[PDB]
Amino acid sequence: TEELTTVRDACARTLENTARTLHLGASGTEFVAAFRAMTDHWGAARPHDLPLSDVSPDGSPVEYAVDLGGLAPALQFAMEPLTAGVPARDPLAARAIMPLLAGRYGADATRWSALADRLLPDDAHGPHVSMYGAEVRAGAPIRFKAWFYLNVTGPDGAFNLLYSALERMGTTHLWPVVQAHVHRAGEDVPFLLSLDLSDDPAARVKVYFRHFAADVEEVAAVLKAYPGFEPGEVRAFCKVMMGGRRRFSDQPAVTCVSLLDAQTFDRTAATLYVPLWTYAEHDGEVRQRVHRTLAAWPEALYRYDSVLAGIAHRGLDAGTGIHNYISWQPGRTRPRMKVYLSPEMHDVTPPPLGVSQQHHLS
Ligand SMILES: N[C@@H](Cc1c[nH]c2ccccc12)C(=O)O
Numbered sequence: 001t002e003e004l005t006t007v008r009d010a011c012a013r014t015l016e017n018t019a020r021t022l023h024l025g026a027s028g029t030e031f032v033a034a035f036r037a038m039t040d041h042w043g044a045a046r047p048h049d050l051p052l053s054d055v056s057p058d059g060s061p062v063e064y065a066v067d068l069g070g071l072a073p074a075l076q077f078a079m080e081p082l083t084a085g086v087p088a089r090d091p092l093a094a095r096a097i098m099p100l101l102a103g104r105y106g107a108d109a110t111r112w113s114a115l116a117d118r119l120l121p122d123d124a125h126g127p128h129v130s131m132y133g134a135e136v137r138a139g140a141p142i143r144f145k146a147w148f149y150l151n152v153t154g155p156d157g158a159f160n161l162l163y164s165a166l167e168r169m170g171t172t173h174l175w176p177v178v179q180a181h182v183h184r185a186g187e188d189v190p191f192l193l194s195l196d197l198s199d200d201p202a203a204r205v206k207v208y209f210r211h212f213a214a215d216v217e218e219v220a221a222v223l224k225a226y227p228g229f230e231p232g233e234v235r236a237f238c239k240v241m242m243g244g245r246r247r248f249s250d251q252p253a254v255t256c257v258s259l260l261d262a263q264t265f266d267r268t269a270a271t272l273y274v275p276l277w278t279y280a281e282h283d284g285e286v287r288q289r290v291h292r293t294l295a296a297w298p299e300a301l302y303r304y305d306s307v308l309a310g311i312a313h314r315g316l317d318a319g320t321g322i323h324n325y326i327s328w329q330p331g332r333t334r335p336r337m338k339v340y341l342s343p344e345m346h347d348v349t350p351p352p353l354g355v356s357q358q359h360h361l362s
């Protein structure tokens, strides 16, 4: 494919179209401007110019996410701070995003600053060190997010590194929350840590886990103890989204826990994320699964189809890679589900883990 357009412009256009589809109005316009502000550092880069990203498994450095739950529409992007020809693990771009967001949007850097020296060092092991993102609803302020990688000190250092992060934030007393989330030693592993970049009392610290070689019953067992994660509903949702498969045989299931919600019996602390690009022949089949889980709620189905139509740019049956994930939490009028979609700037049908991770592992 001959690339004629910067990554930033191509994704900004798609984001603007999606915001209009979701009726986000002026908040949507500001949201697109925030996307451009966060990606200005990519410069004139076309897709071939940036290092392959971990944001979307095909290597694209953006992921769109749309909340299909019962509340008003919300739109999100995640992106990777990157510079053409500079390894993605280099920390300079990620270090520059935080002061940009603090100065231009008033995003809060307090927890970020406690973590940055440890999680954005000059010598990170893994192929990636950061993602940042933003989410907006009509009429509401944009909320900004940062994600850090727990393989910065090697693939087997994630627990020690995560504990050090909790030390720096003064939250080591929540360590048993992390530990109890591991039901199969060596196969349930923490891999990401995120911050809401806000001083609001609801600002979260989240730990994300991979469940390798897990059956659906084992994923349900992980989630059962969090309020609302009824095993029969969790197992059924997994089986719907995996086309009847009972095992996460290559791509791991993902869950997370919001640490400051685990001891408050208020907002449920947990989320399930089902990866969608390795357990289907193509995105047309994935769409059938999304429709099946949404069939009771036509409003959510129409929102989903409308957003998908503006993001897909080839026939859904050509392969996988447009759908990255769908999440699940219990909700009020229906489960809260968010769908994660790739701009697919690289190859159809990404491998398990992602092109960049596969290259790193060799
Ligand atoms: N693509 C990476 C990181 C990532 C981006 N969006 C996600 C949503 C859920 C879980 C992980 C991710 C992964 O699959 O690990």
Ligand SMILES: CC(C)=CCSP(=O)(O)OP(=O)(O)O
Pocket: 063, 065, 076, 078, 131, 133, 145, 147, 271, 327, 338
């Ligand atoms: C890892 C990435 C980029 C996204 C998954 S976390 P999220 O902020 O989209 O999920 P929630 O809205 O907190 O459920």
Ligand SMILES: [Cl-]
Pocket: none
């Ligand atoms: Cl030409």
Ligand SMILES: [Zn+2]
Pocket: 002
């Ligand atoms: Zn040409």
Ligand SMILES: [Zn+2]
Pocket: 046, 048, 049
């Ligand atoms: Zn070029």
